[PDB]
RNA sequence: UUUUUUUUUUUUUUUUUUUUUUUUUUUUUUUUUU
């Protein structure tokens, strides 16, 4: 049970588990959250996990959430939990801290984005500074970047470039806006346009070799995107803005590995032949196509704002080319 | 290396014909070739 499976397979496994047909199950963390399917034995492979930035010992809250799904009322007299030890003793202080201790409620750092700033500048009145207090040094630095690349003027009035970025919510407002206004995407076909846009959707956490040959084109598109991203990255560092892990290690990861998978999906090819060459499981491929529906909608909106009807019809064709029957399969619970 | 599915609004037709407008006049015998 993990996130790389198709929804139908995952719900099939859940239903079979609920009927007492599965004895041994290897599960990820998502199984514990919700998913009211208790069991009798819970075994921890390790008490540490890698969450984005490095390894970290399990918090007491997660341990309580996972271990609590071990005793079913009526059929069991006690709930057993097994912690493994692999030819090496484990420290007792860490064990006591993980197992015994008051859980703490989570908190968020309230990340500030450029889309939020651009949306807040269009609101009549609403002095922004007096609301941020109830982050101030960061807000001034971000305003200087927006004025440098001509998103706003000297009086902080939103221009045409800023209006487009206000409609892009997913991940990267400034880079996408620069790409659209640079007459990019005007030479490619609908199949090739959606193939290049997957870099903003696929995070490239794999380490497998990318396809050595893609096409004579779609390689110039790779270079153009990387140059534009590199130029935007220099502006960010000029104003001394702290960067997130995702934005810092963007070109370091292999985020272009799914172009071939998306390219053949839109061109028309049986999904069995696609999986013979894709570097990700079936569950991951369907997620990428699902996330590419929102990107096409945003680019269609930007075309109306700037008045380019050629780009509007290209994006309409792309949406119809990435729809298949398997992504609309009915749930087995219904 | 866990974790991440986003998609705005409208209902069943104004009433009475063809006309559709400018610069000033005359006088007495057939037919053909000349």
Query: What HEC string does chain A produce?
Result: CCCCCCHHHHHHHHHHHHCCCCCCCCCCHHHCCCCCCCCCEEEECCCEEECCCCEEECCHHHHHHHHCCCCCCCCCCCCEEEECCCCCCCCHHHHHHHHCCCCCCCCCCCCCCHHHHHHHHCCCCCCCHHHHCCCHHHHHHHHHHHHHCCCECCCCCECHHHHHHCCCCCCCHHHHHHHHHCCCCCCCCHHHHHHHHHHHCCCCCCCCCCCCCCCCCCCHHHHHHHHHHHHHHHHHHHCCCCCCHHHHCCCCCCCCCCHHHHHHHHHCCCHHHHHCCCCCCHHHHHHHHHHHHHHHHHHHHHHHHHCCHHHHHHHHHHHHHCCCHHHHCCCCCC
Residue nearest to nucleotide B2 (CA to C1'): A51
Tokens of A220: 């110039």
The resolution, in angstroms to one decimal, equals 2.5
Whether the beta carbon of A249 falls within 7 A of nucleic chain B: the reply is no
Å from A75 (CA) to B9 (C1')?
A: 55
Whether the beta carbon of A127 falls within 7 A of nucleic chain B: the reply is no
Q: How far apart are CA A249 and CA A108, in angstroms?
A: 22
Residue A2's nearest nucleotide, by CA–C1', is B2
Tokens of A298: 């945003």
CB-contacted nucleotides of strand B (7 Å): 1-7
Whether the beta carbon of A207 falls within 7 A of nucleic chain B: the reply is no
Tokens of A188: 């490619």
Residue nearest to nucleotide B6 (CA to C1'): A294
Which string of b and e fits A288-300 if b means at least 16 CB within 10 Å?
A: bbeebeebbebbb
Q: How far apart are CA A247 and CA A245, in angstroms?
A: 6
Å from A122 (CA) to B13 (C1')?
A: 44
Q: Which of residues 54-93 of A touch strand B (CB under 7 A)?
A: none
Residues in chain A: 334
Tokens of A280: 């990700």
Residue A53's nearest nucleotide, by CA–C1', is B1
């Amino acid at each position: 049970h993990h996130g790389g499976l198709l929804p139908i397979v995952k719900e099939l496994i859940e239903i079979l588990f609920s009927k007492g047909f599965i004895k041994v199950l290897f599960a990820t963390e998502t199984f514990a959250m919700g998913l009211n399917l208790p069991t009798r034995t819970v075994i921890f492979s390790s008490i540490r996990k890698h969450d984005g930035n490095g390894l970290r010992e399990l918090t007491p809250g997660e341990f309580t959430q996972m271990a609590g799904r071990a005793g079913r009322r009526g059929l069991d007299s006690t709930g057993t939990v097994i912690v493994m030890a692999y030819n090496s003793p484990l420290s007792i202080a860490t064990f006591k801290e993980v197992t015994m201790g008051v859980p703490t409620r989570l908190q968020s750092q309230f990340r500030l984005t450029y889309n939020m700033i651009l949306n807040l500048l269009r609101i009549e009145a609403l002095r922004v500074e007096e609301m941020i207090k109830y982050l101030l040094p960061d807000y001034e630095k971000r305003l200087a970047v927006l004025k440098d690349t001509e998103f706003i003027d000297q009086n902080h009035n939103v221009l045409l470039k800023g209006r487009v970025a206000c409609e892009i919510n997913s991940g990267y407002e400034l880079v996408l806006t620069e790409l659209i206004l640079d007459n990019f995407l005007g030479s490619f076909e609908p199949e090739e346009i959606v193939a290049l846009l997957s870099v903003f959707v696929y995070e490239g956490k794999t380490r497998e070799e990318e396809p050595p040959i893609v096409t004579p084109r779609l390689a110039k598109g790779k270079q153009r995107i990387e140059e534009i991203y590199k130029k935007m990255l220099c502006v960010f560092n000029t104003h001394q803005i702290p960067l997130t892990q995702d934005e810092a290690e963007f070109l370091d990861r292999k985020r272009f590995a799914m172009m071939n998978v998306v390219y053949e999906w839109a061109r028309g090819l049986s999904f069995k032949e696609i999986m013979e060459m894709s570097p990700e499981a079936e569950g991951t491929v369907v997620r990428v196509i699902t996330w590419l529906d929102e990107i096409c909608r945003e680019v269609k909106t930007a075309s109306i704002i700037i008045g380019n009807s050629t780009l509007h019809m290209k994006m309409s064709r792309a949406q119809e080319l990435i729809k298949r029957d398997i992504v609309f399969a009915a749930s087995l619970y219904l």
